Design a protein around this nucleic acid. Structure first.
Ligand SMILES: [Mg+2]
Ligand SMILES: [Mg+2]
Ligand SMILES: [Mg+2]
Ligand SMILES: [Mg+2]
Ligand SMILES: [Mg+2]
Ligand SMILES: [Mg+2]
Ligand SMILES: [Mg+2]
Ligand SMILES: [Mg+2]
Length: 129
RNA sequence: AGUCAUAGGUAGCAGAACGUUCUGGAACAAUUACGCUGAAAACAGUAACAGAAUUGAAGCUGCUAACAUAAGUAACACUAAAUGGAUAACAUGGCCGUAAGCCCAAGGUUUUGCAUAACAAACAGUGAAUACGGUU
């Protein structure tokens, strides 16, 4: 969530009726998705059905970004931790990695950055001796 | 789901998995896929459970095919010699002349003739009549 706004506007879930890779996804829809819907009231969860394709998990973000994740052969615990990563993020991918100082700010230097002029008056008295 | 303990490795040994082709379980792509990302890796994004393997390739001066490099480089020097706005019929000059001329043999087997581009090989051509060579 950025500035209080939740940033994950919609989640799209695609599955299969007969496919064996969608056993965990059908179990997740049947027993675990009402808890996800109750715990996340800002979310919008769609339910699309693809009768011959592997289960997918498409996350739609409020900055216009979209990220498709495939969840074939996954238990409902692994699907829930995938949605935990999708919900708690802004959607940046595998390639982004953030600034290495781990710090980012407008206005770093209160009192002004050190320059050539900050301690000019003291250094001439230092050179006086 | 909180604390601890362990995690360098060649040869070797052990354990867990990914992927390719085919088959059984009635049929998992007629009208495709395409939010561009996910995962520790092999990878994934058109089942799953089992099974059968000509099942995984930068690495054998391996084989096959294609494409580069050297490189527009080397070569286009055995000879008589060419010129006139043409590989000219005409003119000028030169070279061989016991050959670079003429007639045959062996061998080749149509390589032989025709169009100031062309639509032309699809068309022509080898005649024993001097007691020519053979066949005897
Ligand atoms: Mg070790
Ligand atoms: Mg150690
Ligand atoms: Mg079958
Ligand atoms: Mg399928
Ligand atoms: Mg083999
Ligand atoms: Mg040249
Ligand atoms: Mg001439
Ligand atoms: Mg002859």
């Amino acid at each position: 969530s950025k500035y209080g706004v939740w940033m994950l506007e919609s989640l799209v879930i695609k599955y299969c009726d007969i496919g064996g890779s969608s056993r965990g996804m059908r179990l997740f829809l049947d027993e675990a998705l009402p808890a996800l819907r109750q715990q996340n009231p800002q979310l919008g969860v769609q339910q699309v059905l693809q009768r011959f394709r592997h289960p997918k998990l498409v996350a739609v973000y409020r900055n216009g970004r979209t990220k498709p994740v495939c969840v074939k052969n996954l238990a409902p615990a692994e699907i829930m931790e995938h949605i935990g990563w999708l919900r708690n993020s802004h959607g940046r991918g595998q390639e982004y990695q953030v600034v290495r100082s781990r710090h980012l700010s407008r206005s770093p230097s209160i009192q002004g950055t050190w320059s050539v002029d900050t301690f000019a008056s003291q250094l001439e008295r230092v050179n006086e001796a």
